[PDB]
Design a binder for these strands. Structure first.
Ligand SMILES: [Zn+2]
Ligand SMILES: [Zn+2]
Ligand SMILES: [Zn+2]
Lengths: 33, 78, 27, 89, 32, 198, 43
RNA sequence: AUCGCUUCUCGGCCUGGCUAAGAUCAAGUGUAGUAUCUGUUCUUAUCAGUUUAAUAUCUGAUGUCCUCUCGAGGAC
């Protein structure tokens, strides 16, 4: 599942942990700064 | 190999000291360092189940250079 | 002359004339 | 030392003065302690006026002494909470 | 208090643990 | 009547604060707005646990108490234990014999030693934060053992002065794949005592 | 008059510790139980 | 040397008077509340109603058309 977040491209963070779907990767680290 | 069998140490570098060295170099999710029913002591030669296969390889490469309890620590892929 | 150690507790036939008398009593 | 039942009035205190019997004398009317009895008890109604004249605002004995709030209760100011004379329900 | 590790059973009295001798069912469950 | 976890992630600024069941509340946006502050506390998880709060230990034994340093420096425990052991070796016949004819000297050391233990030797303890929640654990996770930092036993047994023997391997590997946010000072991030990094 | 299992185990342990002849010593252990009641419940 | 028997050897190997059993005995609540053992527990099938933070709880039915004597076959 960490390889799942690696395929998502979001880093293994709490915000990436809070989502169980593939569409949560659009709110990744390259979304806001 | 999610687990890195880390040995080459003594009872001073136990499962908990291996977890401390995992917090130093490369983290271990779990520890499989069981003992017998008559002894009940962690020898330190145990499969530190790391965070990933790359984390177990990092335990096998970077963390397998410590003089753990006087002896040179050696972790292998398991 | 072997003596077993002493262990402290502090630290049947019945005559048939009874039956004969009882049968005669029932009769 | 209290009970989940037997609410008193929950009515705002007036000029009728509280009054304690001997069987529970010296205790606080709220927390039943004995440390610095500071504030006089007012019992808001006909709890003093009429049939319950000179009677206990607690269990029901012959009321002989002025009931007092303790300073621990007046630290959170529980003296303004109202009548503590028990009405059975 | 008294603890039965073969059951993980609390006992306020010693007679509760003495009567706890189901005990053998959870003992055989923990033996597996 | 309610939005999903991805819609709550888009709507709120803290998607990690959006719980699995808090979106099923009557006001999940107000709950997330209340929980988004830095002065908020979570619910203790006994509402989700079948096991009750601090009841199901059931197979362990613990030491009763450790006295503070001023009380141990006065030392009431030694003659208290001596009096308790003498009372244990006493018979009950001796117990009401000493009841009807008592004796002197319970402890009777002094007064200002206990006075100075209470006032002059008084040490303030380590009081925790305003937002600490205690649970069945909550007394063991003291490692945050820093990442990229060794231990005192690893500094002592491997001969690392305040230079680890795996420092060249750690610097050659750079950041480890297990902890990419770990900082290893002296080999990777150019660090006092046991904690040689952060 | 009632006989709990705790009382029965206490009586059995007191018989196995104190023998069979001692009964007031057993009745000291067993609360509200006379030595005749203990002897009758045992035998 | 071997084996047998005999003794000794050192180390873990069983092991307290009498008298009338010397004699005598021994007492509880009401109030609610809680815990512990102990007594019962929990798999047939999906579906919605109800229920709940959600599960649990929770009301109903649990392959079809026909032929052949719960089984089997055919355009399905
Ligand atoms: Zn008060
Ligand atoms: Zn009164
Ligand atoms: Zn009133």
């Amino acid at each position: 599942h960490a390889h799942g977040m690696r395929c998502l491209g979001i880093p293994n963070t709490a915000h990436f942990a809070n989502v169980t779907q593939i569409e949560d990767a659009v709110s990744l680290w390259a979304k806001l700064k | 190999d999610a687990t890195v069998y880390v040995g080459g140490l003594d009872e001073k570098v136990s499962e908990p000291l291996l977890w401390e060295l995992f917090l130093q170099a490369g983290p271990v999710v779990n520890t499989h360092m069981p003992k017998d029913r008559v002894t009940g002591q962690h020898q330190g030669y145990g499969f530190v189940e790391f965070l990933s296969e790359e984390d177990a390889d990092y335990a096998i490469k970077i963390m397998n250079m410590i003089k753990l309890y006087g002896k040179p620590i050696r972790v292998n892929k398991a | 002359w072997k003596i077993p150690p002493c262990i402290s507790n502090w630290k049947v036939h019945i005559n048939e004339n009874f039956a004969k008398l009882a049968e005669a009593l029932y009769i | 030392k209290h009970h989940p039942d037997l609410i008193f009035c929950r009515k705002q205190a007036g000029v009728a003065i509280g009054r304690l019997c001997e069987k529970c004398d010296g205790k606080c009317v709220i927390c039943d302690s004995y440390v610095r009895p500071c504030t006089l008890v007012r019992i808001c109604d006909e709890c003093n006026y009429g049939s319950y004249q000179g009677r206990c605002v607690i269990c029901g004995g012959p009321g002989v002494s002025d009931a007092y709030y303790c300073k621990e209760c007046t630290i959170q100011e529980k003296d303004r909470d109202g009548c503590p004379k028990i009405v059975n329900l | 208090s008294y603890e039965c590790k073969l059951c993980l059973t609390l006992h306020n009295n010693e007679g509760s643990y003495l009567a706890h001798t189901k005990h053998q069912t959870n003992l055989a469950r923990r033996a597996a | 009547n309610r939005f999903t976890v991805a819609e709550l992630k888009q709507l709120v600024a803290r998607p990690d604060v959006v719980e699995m069941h808090d979106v099923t509340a009557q006001d999940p946006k107000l709950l997330v707005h209340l929980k988004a502050t830095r002065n908020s506390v979570p619910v203790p998880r006994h509402w989700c646990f079948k096991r009750k709060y601090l009841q199901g230990k059931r197979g362990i034994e613990k030491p009763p108490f450790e006295l503070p340093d001023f009380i141990k420096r006065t030392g009431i425990q030694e003659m208290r234990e001596a009096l308790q052991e003498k009372e244990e070796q006493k018979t009950m016949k001796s117990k009401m014999r000493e009841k009807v004819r008592p004796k002197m000297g319970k402890i009777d050391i002094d007064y200002q030693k206990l006075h100075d233990a209470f006032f002059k030797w008084q040490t303030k303890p380590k009081l925790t934060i305003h937002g600490d929640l205690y649970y069945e654990g909550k007394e063991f996770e003291t490692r945050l053992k820093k990442p990229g930092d060794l231990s005192d036993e690893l500094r002592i047994s491997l001969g690392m002065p305040v230079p680890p023997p795996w420092l060249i391997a750690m610097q050659r590997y750079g950041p480890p794949p297990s902890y990419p946010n770990l900082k290893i000072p002296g080999l990777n991030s150019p660090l006092y005592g046991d904690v040689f990094g952060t | 008059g009632v006989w709990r299992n705790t009382e029965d185990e206490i009586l059995k342990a007191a018989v196995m510790k104190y023998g069979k002849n001692q009964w007031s010593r057993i009745a000291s252990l067993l609360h509200r139980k006379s030595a005749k009641q203990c002897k009758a419940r045992w035998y």
